[PDB]
Design a protein around this nucleic acid. Structure first.
Ligand SMILES: [Mg+2]
Ligand SMILES: [Mg+2]
Ligand SMILES: [Mg+2]
Ligand SMILES: [Mg+2]
Ligand SMILES: [Mg+2]
Ligand SMILES: [Mg+2]
Lengths: 176, 190, 196, 138
RNA sequence: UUUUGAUCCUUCGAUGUCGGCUCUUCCUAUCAUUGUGAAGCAGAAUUCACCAAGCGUUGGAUUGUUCACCCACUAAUAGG
RNA sequence: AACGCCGGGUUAAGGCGCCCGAUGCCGACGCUCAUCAGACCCCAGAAAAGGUGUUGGUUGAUAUAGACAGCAGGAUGGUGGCCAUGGAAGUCGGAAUCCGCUAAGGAGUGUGUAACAACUCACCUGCCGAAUCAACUAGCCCUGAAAAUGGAUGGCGCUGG
RNA sequence: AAGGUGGCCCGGGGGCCCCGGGUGUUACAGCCCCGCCCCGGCAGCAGCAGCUCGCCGAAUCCCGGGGCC
């Protein structure tokens, strides 16, 4: 699965269809991160297939809805649990990112895993996403930001709109 | 990771009078002046406080490579203070087994002629660095004394004479000849 | 584990400190543990001796400051090679015994000198040996028929000087310290009352 | 030798994007390169905005790092930032820039004639001053 | 890929097939020389390794021989 | 992707420093410095094993009731421990491995010793004040990496790409 | 409860004022959660506060400009 743009979070539930043996099978819920309801339903089927005797053909999906960020203007610290396949072997992780939304964070995880491990999106499975408090946050890149009087400058300021003149007299300054 | 901030202060004594044009530092005091350029290093050198009691040196957004350049400055400045106030006396004793090394000083301690090393006809006309004062001590048979403000120039000139008197093609574990540094200290103690 | 032994130290420090309110803050400086067992053997029943981690004492005492303020003056006192010497029996005799009891150990070639160290004129106690250790320094040593005899007395080390190995060797041979390793008194403390 | 610092409460001028030409306060910090921003009185919604685009001034309206928009509106009106802004020379050379884009052809002609005259007067007075300095020298 | 073999895509209306002589340049996996490290390196003599291929590496008896073996000098009588 | 001869529009697989039509986006997040760097199916070449180069992870110990270096001082007592043996008295084998002061002290790391001497080790006081230590794993780079006319990521060149 | 605002203590910078450090829970700054007040009540509404996040038009129509024939 390509992670194009930015993910949504969807609440998928489904079930096996009735049979003469059991007239009312239990419903099953998941939390799929995906761009759309089509790839959501597909990934749902893959996980259910890994755990339960259940295929898309033998069953049906009852409900796929989008789930909004209930607190979008608060800032949060998300804590993700992973499962990734190496070139050689598989490995579990626990990674902390610092974002506003579940989706923004998951995106950031994908991009980081890609940088640091060249892990391609299909290999990865998401198993738990928990918002975690500053007290319980372990990783020092996060821990440094919890401070009321944070302060820093912008030192070296690389110019943008380089080509708009392309030809000036004055050499550009970057110190303000 | 990108560390948001590092800094380290050096509380200087009242005798010295530093000043700075940006990165280039100048330090004056009793024994003389000392300038030193840091333009390669890229840091914030704040000279805050009345009585000029302390230097502070910030470093915003540094990684592991860039954090190492703070304490190195701190130390280079401290040694500069020693060089302006007290100075640097590098002692070094001439070791030999059988053949005695006839040493002689030229140009009021700038130059050093070293004769009869292992009975070699070649003679080592070693030149000291600028701002260095060679001198044979008194009350000691085999004793050079190199005085000066800059430790760098002193110590390099020391190694110059040391590597100049080196035994080629021989078992150095046995033939323990040549000049060797013994005691590093200052002109006046504190 | 280290965390539980530390909390155990807090279990000793609170019970003896609350029950017994009186300490002699003596300083066990470089004294050996065998010498310590002889002094503990002397003050086995009556006294109860203590050392530990400086911050371990800092928080045990900060805990004491809520209930018993008597240990408020102790916080600055545990500094240098310092330890408490809790005691119920008597104050002046334990003070004199603690200042006295020192076993003369070997002379250290290296530590600082408070006062002048001395080298008396006395025979070596050997056969024909190398005179260069004594004649290097500047002491008159004669060969009284084979056996070496010392002519004149000279004081080698002065107040505040590093003890070399050569100047150390004669104290190592005699095994007689000028000043013994020991336990130095700091202050007396009787129920919230300092004695200099 | 840094003079302006990113401090919660500091005002920034928006260079480009959708919200160009607008003033806005830095409410909070997320990371090295992304901050929470809001400008209630200038018609800008509470939103994320990277430090890249913005360029910070020397004004620091005071409020807590997580203060909800009410206390910001009151503190903004209380300080009266907008007027001090309009006093700044900055804004004046911005309005000049814009008037120069708006420049009409008739105004362009009147201006050319104004220049022509103002510069002939200056040329006369300056030449008399140079002969005056020669007179002073002589 | 300096041996040898395995293969048959190219040429049989013809690519002159073994050795020596003469001559140029080229590679380095350094025999010797220059500078240096290590040795169960005291000095001498001798071993191992790094930079380095710019300059050198012979005269003869026997065999068509390449190869082989031997005498003599050498700093060295390295390999392609 | 398949073709009669043409005008207009749009696309595929590929691409957009300049050669060479097109980003002269205020494009987003990160990694990496190589005195042999690296650059897109088939493709025209390299590995096992390393690295206190660096970036992340896992597990297990340690931590503000405050370590771990560091400088110093002790750096040892039952005890020549019993069984082995000839001796393990700290230092072939083999049995031992409990106790004391305790801040801590093994029937002992090395030099040096049949074991001591001499130098020396684990363990802790003095000061010191926040995070520290060990073993694994995978990411990039590096070592491992030699052949003959002068030479080829297509060239020029490229290190906020 | 705290990423601790005023108060208190220690420092460090000025001779009553300014800057670091330490306890702590609203006080002249705030944040977090439960219950009850007609889903508490008021506009407005995928918001010209011209881009905080989407999917659509029998639940949708209009106007304008260029090119070729
Ligand atoms: Mg064929
Ligand atoms: Mg032919
Ligand atoms: Mg022919
Ligand atoms: Mg080579
Ligand atoms: Mg030799
Ligand atoms: Mg091309």
């Amino acid at each position: 699965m390509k992670a194009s743009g930015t993910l949504r979070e969807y609440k998928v539930v489904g079930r096996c269809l009735p049979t003469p043996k059991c007239r009312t099978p239990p419903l099953y819920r998941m939390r799929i991160f995906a761009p759309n309801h089509v790839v959501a339903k597909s990934r749902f089927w893959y996980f259910v297939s890994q755990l339960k005797k259940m295929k898309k053909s033998s069953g049906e999906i009852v409900y796929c809805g989008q789930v909004f960020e209930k607190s979008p203007l608060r800032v949060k610290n998300f804590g993700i649990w992973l499962r990734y396949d190496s070139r050689s072997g598989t490995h579990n992780m626990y990674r902390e990112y610092r974002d506003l939304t579940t989706a923004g964070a998951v995106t950031q995880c994908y991009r980081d895993m890609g940088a640091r491990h060249r892990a391609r999106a299909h290999s990865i499975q998401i198993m738990k996403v928990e918002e975690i408090a500053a007290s319980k946050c372990r990783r020092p890149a996060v821990k440094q930001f919890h401070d009321s009087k944070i302060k820093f400058p912008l030192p070296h300021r690389v110019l943008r709109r380089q080509h708009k003149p392309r030809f000036t007299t004055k050499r550009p300054n970057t110190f303000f | 990771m990108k560390t948001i901030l590092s800094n380290q202060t050096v509380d200087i004594p009242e005798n010295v009078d530093i000043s700075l044009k940006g990165r280039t530092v100048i330090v004056k005091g009793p024994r003389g002046t000392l300038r030193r350029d840091f333009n390669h290093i890229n840091v914030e050198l704040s000279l805050l406080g009345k009585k000029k009691k302390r230097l502070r040196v910030d470093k915003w957004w540094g990684n592991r490579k860039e954090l190492a350049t703070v304490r190195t400055i701190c130390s280079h400045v401290q040694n500069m203070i020693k060089g302006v106030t007290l100075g640097f006396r590098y002692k070094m004793r001439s070791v030999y087994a059988h053949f005695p090394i006839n040493v002689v000083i030229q140009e009021n301690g700038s130059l050093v002629e070293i004769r009869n090393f292992l009975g070699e006809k070649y003679i080592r006309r070693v030149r000291m660095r600028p701002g260095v004062a060679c001198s044979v001590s008194q009350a000691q048979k085999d004793e050079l004394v190199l005085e000066g403000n800059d430790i760098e120039l002193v110590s390099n000139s020391a190694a110059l004479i040391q590597q100049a008197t080196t035994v080629k093609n021989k078992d150095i574990r046995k033939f323990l000849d040549g000049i060797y540094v013994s005691e590093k200290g200052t002109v006046q103690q504190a | 584990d280290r965390a539980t032994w530390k909390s155990n130290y807090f279990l000793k420090i609170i019970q003896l400190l609350d029950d017994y309110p009186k300490c002699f803050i003596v300083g066990a400086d470089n004294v050996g543990s065998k010498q310590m067992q002889q002094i503990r053997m002397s003050l086995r029943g009556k006294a109860v001796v203590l050392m530990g981690k400086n911050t371990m004492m800092r928080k045990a005492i900060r805990g004491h400051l809520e209930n018993n303020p008597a240990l408020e003056k102790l916080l600055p006192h545990i500094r240098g090679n310092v330890g408490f010497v809790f005691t119920k029996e008597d104050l002046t005799e334990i003070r004199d015994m603690l200042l006295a009891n020192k076993v003369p150990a070997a002379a250290r070639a290296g530590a600082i000198a408070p006062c002048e160290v001395t080298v008396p004129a006395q025979n070596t106690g050997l056969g024909p040996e190398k005179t260069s250790f004594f004649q290097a320094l500047g002491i008159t040593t004669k060969i009284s028929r084979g056996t070496i005899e010392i002519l004149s007395d000279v004081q080698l080390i002065k107040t505040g000087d590093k003890v070399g190995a050569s100047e150390a060797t004669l104290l190592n041979m005699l095994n007689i310290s000028p000043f013994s390793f020991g336990l130095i008194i700091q202050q007396v403390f009787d129920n919230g009352s300092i004695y200099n | 030798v840094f003079r302006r610092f990113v401090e919660v409460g500091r005002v920034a001028y928006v260079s480009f994007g959708p919200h160009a030409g607008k003033l806005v306060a830095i409410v909070d910090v997320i990371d090295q390169n992304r901050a929470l921003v809001d400008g209630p009185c200038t018609r800008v919604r509470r939103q994320a905005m990277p430090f890249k685009c913005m360029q910070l001034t020397d004004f620091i309206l005071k409020f807590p790092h997580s203060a909800r928009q009410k206390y910001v509106r009151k503190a903004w009106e209380k300080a009266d930032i907008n007027t001090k802004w309009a006093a700044t020379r900055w804004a004046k050379k911005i309005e000049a820039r814009e008037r120069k884009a708006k420049m009409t052809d008739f105004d362009r002609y009147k201006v050319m004639k104004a220049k022509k005259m103002r510069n002939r007067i200056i040329k006369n007075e300056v030449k008399k001053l140079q002969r005056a300095a020669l007179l002073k020298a002589s």
